[PDB]
Amino acid sequence: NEYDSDITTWSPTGRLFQIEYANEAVNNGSATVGVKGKNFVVLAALKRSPVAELSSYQEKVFEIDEHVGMSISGLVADGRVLARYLRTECMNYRYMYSNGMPMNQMADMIGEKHQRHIQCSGKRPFGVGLLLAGYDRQGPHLYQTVPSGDVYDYKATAMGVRSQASRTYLERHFEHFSDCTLDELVTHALKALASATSEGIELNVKNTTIAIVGKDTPFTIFEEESARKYLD
Amino acid sequence: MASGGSVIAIKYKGGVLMAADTLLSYGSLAKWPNIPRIRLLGSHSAVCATGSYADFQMMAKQVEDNIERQKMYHNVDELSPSEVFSYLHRSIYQKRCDFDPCLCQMVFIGVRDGETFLAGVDDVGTRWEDDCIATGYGAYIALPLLRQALEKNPDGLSRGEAMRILTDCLRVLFYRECRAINKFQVADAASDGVRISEPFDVETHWEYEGYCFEKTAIIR
């Protein structure tokens, strides 16, 4: 393939292989799901599950401002860059307007940042997918983003490894989510997140994060007390 | 150095009124008496400045544009009044930090969803919110009167009472502020958005017996 070595090179069929390859980074990260109810958005991310008595945190999920936060999959270090960027843009915005940056504007931004890295020599695509969940005057939002710079506004979604099955699950149930309560949204997320576990692993408080955000509920990653409630 | 004189504002039950003379002066010279000094910002707010009109005009353009673009370019709700006011205040402050101050005091009003907003910002980035606000000589002459009307009606003023007291102050500013004219506009912010009145004048009294030639004569 003479055309897959540079982000500035179209292939003769009109593809950009470096961007399709950055996508692979995302398809190979740990699964994450998000779902969007009437008033709430739930992110649930698979972490990495103990190697016997022998743990391992990585920060997948990030708060970004009171009203928004995100879950990443793929190259974690790109995650952090994007997280730093979003955090900073949200503080500038809140500094200026004394209110949270609205999600449709933040999705516009995160997508422009990506595009800035798929058109010039020696920049490269972010190898990270985001679920961005947030709540504003227009209600809850859930965006998926991808290396290509696209930003999808979803009702539910998942990404990462084996997350095709999470998407099969979500496709059955997603039309109800607008009526569900926060507890059933969380149930639905966890269920979907579990359709993405390998064989005989199951969800528990130490291989699963849950974040929620919504009306009168700042974005909140769940710790071991509140998580346990939902995981049984 | 075209400059605008006082602005005054008061909250009533339902809205906010802001009033200003339609005059720009250049030093002592009354230069243009037909200037619409109040300016709408977005769908819910209006702003008016005392001080350098040029500064005002550049600042108000910056804010109008920011509002319009934020909304046209993203599928987002227009900025609230507090948000616009916040923006304007930070803008004004940034300019005082660059030693390029926006040399106006401004009053800002806005209403959205029957929440009202009335604030003042000054060249250095002071900002404050109150049930009445004034700038220029408004702040020396009218605030005391407006304040007095809000002490007396602690349940809030009606629109008519508010407009009665605003008008009383315009008249007083007319008498005691040198650089003024008896032509005013009043913006009214309510639910519906903001309307600016057509220019109007207030009745003046000049025929007190003590103003007569014989009494005010220095030499008998």
TrEMBL record, chain A:
Signal peptide range in chain numbering: none
GO cellular component, one term: proteasome core complex, alpha-subunit complex
Domain Proteasome alpha-type subunits: start-end pairs: 3-25
Residue ranges of the TM segments: none
Subcellular location: Cytoplasm; Nucleus
Keywords, comma-separated and alphabetical: Cytoplasm, Nucleus, Proteasome
GO BP: any one term: ubiquitin-dependent protein catabolic process
Family: Belongs to the peptidase T1A family.
Record's subunit section: The 26S proteasome consists of a 20S proteasome core and two 19S regulatory subunits. The 20S proteasome core is composed of 28 subunits that are arranged in four stacked rings, resulting in a barrel-shaped structure. The two end rings are each formed by seven alpha subunits, and the two central rings are each formed by seven beta subunits. The catalytic chamber with the active sites is on the inside of the barrel.
Function: The proteasome is a multicatalytic proteinase complex which is characterized by its ability to cleave peptides with Arg, Phe, Tyr, Leu, and Glu adjacent to the leaving group at neutral or slightly basic pH. The proteasome has an ATP-dependent proteolytic activity.
Stated name of the protein: Proteasome subunit alpha type-1
TrEMBL record, chain B:
Record keywords, A-Z: Cytoplasm, Nucleus, Proteasome
PROSITE patterns: PROTEASOME_BETA_1
One GO-annotated biological process of the protein: proteolysis involved in protein catabolic process
GO cellular component: cytoplasm; nucleus; proteasome core complex, beta-subunit complex
Subcellular localization(s) per the UniProt record: Cytoplasm; Nucleus
Entries under InterPro entries matching the protein: Ntn_hydrolases_N (IPR029055), Proteasome_beta4 (IPR016295), Proteasome_bsu_CS (IPR016050), Proteasome_sua/b (IPR001353), Proteasome_suB-type (IPR023333)
Major localization class: cytoplasm
Coiled coil: none
Record flagged with keyword Cytoplasm: yes
Pfam families: Proteasome
Protein's UniProt keywords contain Nucleus: yes
Binding partners and assembly: The 26S proteasome consists of a 20S proteasome core and two 19S regulatory subunits. The 20S proteasome core is composed of 28 subunits that are arranged in four stacked rings, resulting in a barrel-shaped structure. The two end rings are each formed by seven alpha subunits, and the two central rings are each formed by seven beta subunits. The catalytic chamber with the active sites is on the inside of the barrel.
Family classification: Belongs to the peptidase T1B family.
Free-text function comment from the UniProt entry: Non-catalytic component of the proteasome.
Protein name: Proteasome subunit beta
Organism: Leishmania tarentolae
